[PDB]
Amino acid sequence: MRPFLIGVSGGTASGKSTVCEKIMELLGQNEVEQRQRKVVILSQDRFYKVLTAEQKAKALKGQYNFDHPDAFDNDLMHRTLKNIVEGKTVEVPTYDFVTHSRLPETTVVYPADVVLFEGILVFYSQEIRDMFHLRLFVDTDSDVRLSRRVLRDVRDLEQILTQYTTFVKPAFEEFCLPTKKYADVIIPRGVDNMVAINLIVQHIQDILNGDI
Amino acid sequence: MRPFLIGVSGGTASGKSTVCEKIMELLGQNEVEQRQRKVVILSQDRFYKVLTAEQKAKALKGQYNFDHPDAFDNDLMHRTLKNIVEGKTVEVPTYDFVTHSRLPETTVVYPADVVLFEGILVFYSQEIRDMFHLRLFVDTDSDVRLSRRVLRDVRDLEQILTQYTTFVKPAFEEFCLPTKKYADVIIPRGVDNMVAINLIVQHIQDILNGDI
Amino acid sequence: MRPFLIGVSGGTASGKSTVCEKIMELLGQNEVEQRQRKVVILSQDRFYKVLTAEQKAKALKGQYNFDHPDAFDNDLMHRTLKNIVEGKTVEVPTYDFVTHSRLPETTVVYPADVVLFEGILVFYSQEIRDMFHLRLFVDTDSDVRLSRRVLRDVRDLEQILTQYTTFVKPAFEEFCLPTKKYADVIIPRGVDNMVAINLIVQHIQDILNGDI
Amino acid sequence: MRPFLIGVSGGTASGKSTVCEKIMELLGQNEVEQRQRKVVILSQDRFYKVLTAEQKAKALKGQYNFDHPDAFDNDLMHRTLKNIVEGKTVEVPTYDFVTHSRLPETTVVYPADVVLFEGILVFYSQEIRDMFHLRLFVDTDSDVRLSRRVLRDVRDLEQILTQYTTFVKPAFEEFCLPTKKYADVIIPRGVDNMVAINLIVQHIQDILNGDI
Known part of the structure; x- marks a missing residue:
């Protein structure tokens, strides 16, 4: 099928995004202007909703859940994908x-x-889920993810931690982790896993070369 | 590298062996006499030791641990593989x-x-471990594995269960499960996972076709 | 508070029920006619619904989920407990x-x-949950529980296994396991854990002696 | 037996130590000079070894494993306990x-x-292990523990995280977590669990009152 849609999930800072970046790099695609690319990365976080005045006020005081499915503009996400699939x-x-x-x-x-x-x-959501030809899940322990997440988020510590305890952890466990069961292939660790990356890169090259 | 060695591990009845059989079938290799095959399956259980008179007497009374690394003729296994690798x-x-x-x-x-x-x-063991070009681990919950194992082993129930409780479970947890960390790619479920199988089958076909 | 309500949960064959029986035995209460008892055991499975003609027909063909919350007559359970609490x-x-x-x-x-x-x-359910003065959860691995469950259910094997795979396992994981987070005290293993039992037995004796 | 030895384990920042402190507080024992106390807290971390010049040099550069059993002066620990038990x-x-x-x-x-x-x-170690009349394990998820640990250790962030990734996590998983199987009673969360604390406090009061 054209385009071939590969879904990559996992907790935040699992390596789901480092893996995609690595795949693009090895394919050479990151050295090509957007419009000339044959392989593209799409992040779900481009589809966060615009917050209302008061959801925004909750967010500054760290009391807004960015890990709940309702945090995402799902309609926009779904229509965007439905157009990508239609080759537009x-x-x-x-x-x-x-x-x-x-x-x-x-x-x-x-x-x-x-x-x-x-x-x-x-x-x-099943609508989006059924659109993938390949479903990957990058499985990395929570403590490891929290350390990367913490390091990346310092660029306030106490509020990062409070928000992770109250909102990120519960929501990861309720909404994100259960979706592991849909994965075709589980990739442990992240970008460290060069053999996994290369396997996927080779599969993508077969698609681009027309070897399937 | 030639031969390309793919290691496939997991608990007993995980699907590690159904997956290999499925791979051979889809490749068409199971419809070919042993000597003419380009792809081969090798099971570790061919390398169980010959038991002494009294280890045998323990085994009949269900008191011999077949899931301990010492249950395997490792020297023979290692030399066999070391010869396969050398193309013999x-x-x-x-x-x-x-x-x-x-x-x-x-x-x-x-x-x-x-x-x-x-x-x-x-x-x-690291000696064997480092010989693999690709390491797969078929990850299936213990309760699911025990049901398949139980069904397969009826062909006595109470002793199957006692032996699993005393020996199989502890040894799986101490020796087998910790080796998951070496897996490049984790395959959940088993033979149900057709997308995973096909990914590996395609990779193998690239090797056989010389597309790498 | 009088009566003191102790909730004991866990998967089927976890030991939740062996533990209660052991507690009654050590207290000496199982050698006393029902009406003279100061300590009582109440099982949730007394509150299974009466099946309709066709739910019954599903059950014979192994296609009825006895591990879903809807399998239980919750209204009856709740009113019964609400009366026990009221000292009736x-x-x-x-x-x-x-x-x-x-x-x-x-x-x-x-x-x-x-x-x-x-x-x-x-x-x-929170209604029932909030009624407990003490909440215990007997935590036993699924494979261990399935072996006890299997042994107890032979008194047909293949249908036991099929029903556990299709219905018991998924429902335990979706409904029962998440309720572990409400436990005050987690008791590993079951009746093997004599030190845990004795701790609870001593607490109960303090209540009966009026040492609290 | 006199003294009654209660072992409390768990990962660092699990709540194992907050729970003990809470127990002392509720017993009123923390408002009593050391010499007059009937209940005492003993931490394993009092038994860390004095480092050699070069183990110390590894520690400053964050390359010394404080979570390995060899990090502890076990001989001293064991003899100290063996004297406490002997009522000295x-x-x-x-x-x-x-x-x-x-x-x-x-x-x-x-x-x-x-x-x-x-x-x-x-x-x-079994020597120490067998000395306990009651064994408790405070079970708290690693990500939660790491956040408390991180917060407590800021009083450098990057080296805290690197050291936890390289040394603390692997050693917790290899040495500490497997010892959960010895616990009589598992206490989830930590000091939040007031019902668990009170159960143990009541048991201790029975011992001190001579109600057992």
Whole structure:
């Protein structure tokens, strides 16, 4: 099928996104302007909702759940994917993590042969789930993920930790972890796993070469 | 590298062996006489030791641990593999599960392009472990495995259960499960996972076609 | 508070019920006619619903889920407990596992000082959950539970296994296991754990002696 | 038996130590000079070895494993306990976490009726293990523990995380977690679990009152 949709899920900082980046790099695709690419990465976090005045006020005081499925603009996500699958050019938002808002300009995604769709909840809903030709889950222990997440989020410590305890952990466990059962292939660790990456890279090259 | 060695581990009745059989079937290799095959399956259980008179007497009374690494003739296993890797013809034993002994005649394995080596402990020792180009682990919950194992072993129930409680479970947990960390790719469920099988089958076909 | 309600949960064959029986035995209460008892055991499985003609027909063909919360007459359970708590005499059904029906005669439970309420789902609903002064969870691995369950259920093997795979396992994981988080005290293994039993038995004796 | 030895284990920041402190507080024992106490807390971390010049140099550069059983002066620990059990006054070291050394002055522990012995590895060796009348394990998820540990250790972030990834996590999993199987009673969460604490506090009061 064209485009071939590969779903990649896992907890935040599992390596789901490092793996996709690594795949693009090894394919040489990251050295090519967006419009000329045959392989594309799509993150679920581009589809976070624009917050209302008061959801925003909850977010500053660390009391808004970004790991609940309702945190995502699912309708937009689904229609975007449904257009990618139909082989069309789509416009895609950019999300500002600091200003919990969606940026003025959109990103243009031209038809690809392969789409890497990554995110914490890309297997949650059956509509999206059934769109994948291959479903990957990057399985990394929570304590390891929290250390990467913590390191990445220092760029306040206490509120990072409080928010993870109250919201991220419970929601990962209720919504994200149960979706592991849909994975075709489980990739442990993340970008460390070069043999796993190469297996997927080789599969993608067969698709691009037309060896299937 | 030639032969390409794929290690497949997991608990007993995980699907590690159903997956290998499925791979051979889809490749068409199971419809070919042993000597003409390019892809071969090798089970670790061909390398169980011949029991002494009294280890045998323990086995009838269900008191012998077949899931401990010492249950395996490791020296023979290692030399056999070391010869397969060197591209040589090897002789391989057949083990009789009922008579806890090794059968009169050996099986001849001719040089293959791909070797699927499956077993509960094929990642336990570093010598063997480092020989694999690809390491797979078929991850299936213990309760599910025990039901398949139980069904397969009825062909006495109470002693099956007692032996699993005393010996199989503890040894799986101490020796086999910790080796999951060496897996490149984790395959959940078993033969149900057609997408996983096909991914590996495609990789093997690239090797046989010389697309790598 | 009088009666003191102790909830004991865990998977089927975890030991939740062996532990309660052991507690009664050590207290000497099992050598006393029902009406004279100060400590009583109440099983959730007395509260299974009477099946309709066609739910019954599903049950014979092994296609009815006895591990779903809807399998239980929750209203009856809740009112019964709400009366026990109010210090009243209650009538309680007996369930026939073979004929998937409720027996002609009820059992009379007279006011107790302590009630041991055991079952797979006694922490599922908040109404019941909040009634417990002490919440125990007997945590035993699924493979171990399945072996006891299998042994107990032979008194057909293949259908036991099929039903456990299709219905018991999924429902234990979705409904029962998540309720572990409500446990005050986790008791590993079951009746093997004499130190745990004795701790609870001593606590119960303090209540009966009026040392609290 | 007098003294009654209660072992409390769990990962670092599990709550094993908050629970003991809470027990002392509720008993009123923390408002009593050391020498007059009937209940005492003993931490395994008082028994860390004095480092050699070069183990110390490894520690500053974050390359020394404080979670390995060899990190502990086991001989001293064992003899100290063996004297406590024999109802004798013992001297006990104080460890300086910053200067990875043992402080000039020792602490005097007078005979107690109850000893709470807490630490990551107090169930590791059978000699010590068999000395406990009651074995508790405070079970708290690694990600939760790491957040408390991280917060407590800021008083450098990157090296805390690197050291936890390289040394703490692997050693917790290899040495500490497997000892959970020896626990009589598992206490989830930590100090949040007031019902669990009170159960143990009541048991201790029965011992002190001579109700057993």
